[PDB]
Design a protein around this nucleic acid. Structure first.
Ligand SMILES: */N=C(\N)N(C)CC[C@H](N)CC(=O)N[C@H]1C=C[C@H](n2ccc(N)nc2=O)O[C@@H]1C(=O)O
Ligand SMILES: [Mg+2]
Ligand SMILES: [Mg+2]
Ligand SMILES: [Mg+2]
Ligand SMILES: [Mg+2]
Ligand SMILES: [Mg+2]
Ligand SMILES: [Mg+2]
Ligand SMILES: [Mg+2]
Ligand SMILES: [Mg+2]
Ligand SMILES: [Mg+2]
Ligand SMILES: [Mg+2]
Ligand SMILES: [Mg+2]
Ligand SMILES: [Mg+2]
Ligand SMILES: [Mg+2]
Ligand SMILES: [Mg+2]
Ligand SMILES: [Mg+2]
Ligand SMILES: [Mg+2]
Ligand SMILES: [Mg+2]
Ligand SMILES: [Mg+2]
Ligand SMILES: [Mg+2]
Ligand SMILES: [Mg+2]
Ligand SMILES: [Mg+2]
Ligand SMILES: [Mg+2]
Ligand SMILES: [Mg+2]
Ligand SMILES: [Mg+2]
Ligand SMILES: [Mg+2]
Ligand SMILES: [Mg+2]
Ligand SMILES: [Mg+2]
Ligand SMILES: [Mg+2]
Ligand SMILES: [Mg+2]
Ligand SMILES: [Mg+2]
Ligand SMILES: [Mg+2]
Ligand SMILES: [Mg+2]
Ligand SMILES: [Zn+2]
Lengths: 56, 124, 205, 104, 159
RNA sequence: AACCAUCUAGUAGCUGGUUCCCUCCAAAGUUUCCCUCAGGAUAGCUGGCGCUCUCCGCAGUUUUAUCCGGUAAAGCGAAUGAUUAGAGGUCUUGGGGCCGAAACGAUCUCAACCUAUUCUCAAACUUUAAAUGGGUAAGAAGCCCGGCUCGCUGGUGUGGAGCCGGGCGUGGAAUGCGAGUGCCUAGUGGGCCACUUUUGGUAAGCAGAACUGGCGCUGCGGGAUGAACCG
RNA sequence: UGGGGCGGUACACCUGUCAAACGGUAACGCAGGUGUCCUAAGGCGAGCUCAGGGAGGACAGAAACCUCCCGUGGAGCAGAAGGGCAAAAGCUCGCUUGAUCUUGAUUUUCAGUACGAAUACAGACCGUGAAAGCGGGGCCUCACGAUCCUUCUGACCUUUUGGGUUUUAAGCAGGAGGUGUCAGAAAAGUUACCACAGGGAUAACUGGCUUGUGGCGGCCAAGCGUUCAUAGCGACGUCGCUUUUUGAUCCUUCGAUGUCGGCUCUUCCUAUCAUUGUGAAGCAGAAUUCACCAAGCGUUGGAUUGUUCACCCACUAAUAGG
RNA sequence: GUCUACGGCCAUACCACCCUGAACGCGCCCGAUCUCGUCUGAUCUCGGAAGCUAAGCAGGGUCGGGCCUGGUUAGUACUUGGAUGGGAGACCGCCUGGGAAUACCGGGUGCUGUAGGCUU
């Protein structure tokens, strides 16, 4: 029972019916995978904005 | 016309027949078979009210102003043409020479500058 | 012994020359590719005659051999032992394979080497014959008799070139008198103006 | 291969690098009073024969050699295992190879 | 079946050009990359450490992260029908500032200039780009001599 | 390895059959894993149920900018690798002679080497090198001002990022069009034909791929006749 | 699995090509490799520059050692090939062991799940170097493995049952013992005494397409034929036809197309063995050769072998082929 | 005009050979006591400044080689898409659009940033 091994014949047509959708673009990405030393420091900054509030 | 449009018409040359139409052909087409796209509906261009309601903001109140913009490709072409529903022309009286080939090799496809008018008179 | 030429006519596959990979090849038939009076100056044999192919096909080495031999024989009978120089211009590099059937069957069928053959494009020269313009028709009759070994269709065209050069015959003598071109055995050296000038001095002195 | 017996490396408890005495690892004697052995022996007992599988396709030749790293200072004496790549030949501290020598 | 090796079909891609082997010019290192800067990729054989995978070759993205000597970078890879934005750690040597965005930014700056001026005057300057138009009518002065007559040459067989 | 009944309606990835109308939508024979190749799962394709907004967003498209690419061709007087032909050299050396014992004395030579030339080539050689194509951008998520925080880094109220507060609308290429989103979900996983490129094979209505479209799911006019041809 | 079997491993891996200029792509297609090796062939720093060739010098010689000059890499870097490298990734010295401890993030295969492999950062202790730095194995691209069980190391760690102590066991975290049919059953043969479900997804006859092989036939004319190429032949080469051989293929049928030969019997094809009519001969006659029209009418009796085929005796006008 | 230290682009800057260089620098140059390293104070390290541009370096030169850039090669080869176009096949022609490479013949031979010199 020999049988055909591989093809890519009607695949394009399948993909384009529902569409080659772009990745949902979004402002504000996560900050996952960002150098912890920098991130630590930004966290401490947001923590201490409160102290220098009155001047603003 | 412009580079942007003409390159697409090149890419589909074999399926179309285009050219430079005359004023009378514009009259015949608009007047006889004018149907506007009003509220997503194919409604017949029988009174100017139907135009004033939609295009009053461009001082377009009648068939004539419309013609003027079309022949003089004025400012507000986009709106004037998108208002017009694709023209349902009939089968050509007299016949066609040969659908498959280009005009130069004795066919109908492609740019046949002026002879489009002769073809319109045979199709309308 | 060997097969007919219907099998290896058309340019089907890619070129599969002898190399590192294909070894164990039996040697080609045609080894002496030119003959006549090869030891001969350019000026004495002006007239050239080509045999032009007109089909994108493969000619065998065996036909090259037979045709060379028959042309030699006729020219020997006609124009004597020292009145020409034949030059075959088609070295056969493409290797042809053969699928032998000795119970395995058709599986793993990749051929052993049978032999060589030369690929040809339209307008490529096969043979050339240089002698004087006097013996033009006899050259013609030799090449017309040689057509019958090869297949297809080929035209017999007399060349405009003076011998085996890329320079036309009418302006040639003026160029040689003023020493642009210089004979150098069978070949001929084109002198430009770009070299150093003391060479030009050595030339005219 | 050949590797030297002393190695200077990390200790978790001390926190520093300190010398370690190196020696290769061995399998212990299988305990009779473990849990798995009690379970086997009770299932295998009585009629029914071989209950659990016996592996028979020993394909590959070599092991990963393991090192028992004893710390040298008398307070610690803490050991720890250290794995290495496959090797056929092996030896401890045998003739650290010379350079620029003659062959006989 | 082919193999799924990392450097398959990279005999020529990474090979450095002719008479441009050797040392890497130091601008490459000593130039700076901000966040959100649009950056295009070009592999390089000399440095084997931190090469991107050949698929991302050519692709251009924007920089989401920075380290001592490298940048994480967002690219849109197509797989069987869905695209995936995915992030790659590339050492600097394989990288260039793509200059596509700079001309646009020049045009915004030009419009704010051209709007501040020709504002008080009241002249309405064309801001928009307007596609290549149909060329206008003109006169061809045949000053004197007449057109040279071209004739189709007759055939002649060189070969 | 007898006969009767019971356990027994014993299991089956295998054949076979499976009961009224109309209306609406409408497929696959491909990926990866499996003692998997007459079978499943799993992604893919499909339907139905809805929901959030609409009367700024998106597109199998072009244009303008800007990168990427190493096939066709062409090349060997350029690299690598084969390869034919004659010229000029002296010894950089040698085989047959001949007057020479021999001898780079000479002597005919013919040999290899060196220099300018010349005929022919390359899927696993290439300096050059296209057409078709693949990417990224074409503005409010933007530009420009005024100012706070930092345990990071730093000659420097430096750099960088982050924080607040105001100000600019001709919305910044052509064309078209309503978008987004979440649940549950059956069947299929035996394929095939034609234009072009292409591999094995002498070839085959043969075997194995790419790109696009059809048949299978689809009747019609023509080709007398025909699953795939032309309309 | 181009019927199965026997044979290969294309059953997990890696390089180059095939690939049609992004990437991705198949055949029991091609050319090839792997189940290791390393105490340094790993890690820093300094200093050196290779292959090959030329001219010289006792023994010395084509080839031993010293010296000057040229030397874009023509050598070398453990290994397959491919890419990469010159005050270096090569070669020689000096000191060392980041081949260590530990969280998570990402890339490659991809279902975008795992293993493996690797890349950017971060926190500790270190190494080296005057110092900027560099280093968490081998210049890059391959060298390897789940649950369950056992085993070792680790904390003044938890439980061991009505309470308390102490042995033992069970827990927790991290390595190892191995599954190569490599996402991992624990496994030898025969049936012609045979049995059951099904298969034209799959052979052994016929039928179809192809014609290598076989059979027949053309073109050129170097030579035989005394002579003279072509009366009769025709090499080295080359172009076609046929489907009575043989092979290659699997579209049809496995809920059954009765499978070798002989006997008997009809008709049919022509590529003419003989007869009728005629051309040509190195045809005097006879006998014998080559070719055209032509297939209406004929083409045997027997020994041996299951034989078709083969070989032989005897008559004949002839004992042609399908 | 021109140079030095540190450079960016990395041959219009390289190679070969010939000619000329005012002033300070750059160089060559003479020594080994200490620091330092050698088979050897030649190289490397250190202490001097009588002599000289011979060389290095610079600039110019060569119907030079090369490299860089143009024309020619050529609207050829090749190619996206089309047709009941041809042809026994091989292959070929046309429409619509894109468009190359040698030989050959011309031209060119470093640009420049900071700081500091000489011509006081
Ligand atoms: N026990 C004896 N003596 N014999 C001969 C075997 C009997 C078996 N059981 C029956 C049989 O006939 N076996 C044959 C059948 C066909 C098969 N075969 C035929 C043809 C081809 N091309 N291939 C095949 O495989 O071979 C079997 C055999 O001979 O073993
Ligand atoms: Mg009528
Ligand atoms: Mg082929
Ligand atoms: Mg028992
Ligand atoms: Mg039942
Ligand atoms: Mg039953
Ligand atoms: Mg059945
Ligand atoms: Mg390639
Ligand atoms: Mg080519
Ligand atoms: Mg289901
Ligand atoms: Mg097929
Ligand atoms: Mg099939
Ligand atoms: Mg359909
Ligand atoms: Mg249809
Ligand atoms: Mg018909
Ligand atoms: Mg059609
Ligand atoms: Mg159609
Ligand atoms: Mg099987
Ligand atoms: Mg590719
Ligand atoms: Mg491609
Ligand atoms: Mg660290
Ligand atoms: Mg290495
Ligand atoms: Mg388990
Ligand atoms: Mg398994
Ligand atoms: Mg034959
Ligand atoms: Mg004769
Ligand atoms: Mg079948
Ligand atoms: Mg039946
Ligand atoms: Mg029957
Ligand atoms: Mg006949
Ligand atoms: Mg000295
Ligand atoms: Mg000097
Ligand atoms: Mg020059
Ligand atoms: Zn310790």
């Amino acid at each position: 029972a020999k049988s055909k091994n591989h093809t890519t014949h009607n695949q394009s047509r399948k993909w384009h019916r529902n569409g080659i959708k772009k990745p949902r673009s979004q402002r504000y990405e996560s900050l996952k995978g960002v150098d912890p030393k920098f991130l630590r420091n930004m966290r401490f900054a947001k923590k201490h904005n409160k102290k220098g509030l009155k001047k603003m | 016309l412009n580079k942007a449009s003409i390159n697409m018409l090149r890419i589909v040359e074999p399926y179309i027949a285009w050219g430079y139409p005359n004023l009378k052909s514009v009259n015949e087409l608009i007047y006889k078979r004018g149907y506007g796209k009003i509220n997503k509906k194919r409604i017949a261009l029988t009174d100017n009210t139907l135009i004033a309601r939609s295009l009053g903001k461009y001082n377009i109140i009648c068939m004539e102003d419309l013609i003027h913009e079309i022949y003089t490709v004025g400012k507000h072409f986009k709106e004037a043409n998108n208002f017009l529903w694709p023209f349902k022309l009939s089968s050509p009286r007299g016949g066609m020479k040969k659908k498959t080939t280009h005009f130069v090799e004795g066919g109908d496809a492609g740019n046949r500058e002026d002879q489009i008018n002769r073809l319109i008179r045979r199709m309308n | 012994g060997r097969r007919p030429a219907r099998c290896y006519r058309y340019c089907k596959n890619k070129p599969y020359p002898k190399s590192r990979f294909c070894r164990g090849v039996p040697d080609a038939k045609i080894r002496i590719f030119d003959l006549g009076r090869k030891k001969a100056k350019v000026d004495e044999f002006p007239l050239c005659g080509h045999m032009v192919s007109d089909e994108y096909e493969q000619l065998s080495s065996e036909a090259l051999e037979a045709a060379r031999i028959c042309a030699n024989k006729y020219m020997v009978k006609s124009c004597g032992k020292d009145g020409f120089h034949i030059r075959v211009r088609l070295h056969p590099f493409h290797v042809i394979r053969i699928n032998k059937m000795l119970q395995t069957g058709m599986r793993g069928a990749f051929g052993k080497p049978q032999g060589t053959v030369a690929r040809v494009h339209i307008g490529q020269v096969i043979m050339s014959i240089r002698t004087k313009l006097q013996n033009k028709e006899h050259v013609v009759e030799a090449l017309r008799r040689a057509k019958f070994k090869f297949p297809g269709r080929q035209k017999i065209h007399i060349s405009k070139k003076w011998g085996f050069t890329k320079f036309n015959a009418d302006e040639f003598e003026d160029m040689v008198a003023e020493k642009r071109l210089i004979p150098d055995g069978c070949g001929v050296k084109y002198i430009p103006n770009r070299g150093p000038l003391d060479k030009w001095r050595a030339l005219h002195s | 291969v050949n590797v030297p017996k002393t190695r200077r490396t990390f200790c978790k408890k001390c926190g520093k690098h300190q010398p370690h005495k190196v020696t290769q690892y061995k399998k212990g004697k299988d305990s009779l009073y473990a849990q798995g052995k009690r379970r086997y022996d009770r299932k295998q007992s009585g009629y029914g024969g071989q209950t659990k599988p016996i592996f028979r396709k020993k394909a590959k030749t070599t092991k990963k050699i393991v090192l028992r790293l004893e710390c040298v200072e008398p307070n610690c004496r803490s050991k720890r295992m250290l794995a290495i790549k496959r090797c056929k030949h092996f030896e401890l501290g045998g003739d650290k190879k010379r350079k620029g020598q003659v062959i006989q | 079946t082919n193999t799924k090796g990392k450097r398959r079909g990279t005999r020529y891609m990474f090979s450095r050009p002719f008479r441009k082997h050797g040392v890497v010019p130091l601008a490459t290192y000593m130039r700076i990359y901000k966040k959100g800067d649009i950056v295009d990729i070009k592999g390089m054989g000399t440095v084997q450490k931190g090469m991107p995978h050949k698929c991302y070759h050519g692709k251009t993205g924007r920089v989401y992260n920075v380290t001592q000597h490298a940048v994480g970078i967002v690219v849109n890879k197509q797989v069987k029908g869905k695209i995936l934005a995915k992030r790659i750690n590339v050492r600097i040597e394989h990288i260039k500032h793509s200059k596509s965005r700079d001309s646009f930014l020049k045009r915004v700056k030009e419009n704010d200039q051209k709007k501040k001026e020709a504002k008080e005057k009241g002249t309405w300057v064309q801001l928009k780009r307007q596609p290549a138009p149909p060329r206008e009518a003109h006169f061809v002065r045949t000053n004197g001599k007449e057109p040279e007559l071209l004739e189709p040459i007759p055939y002649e067989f060189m070969a």
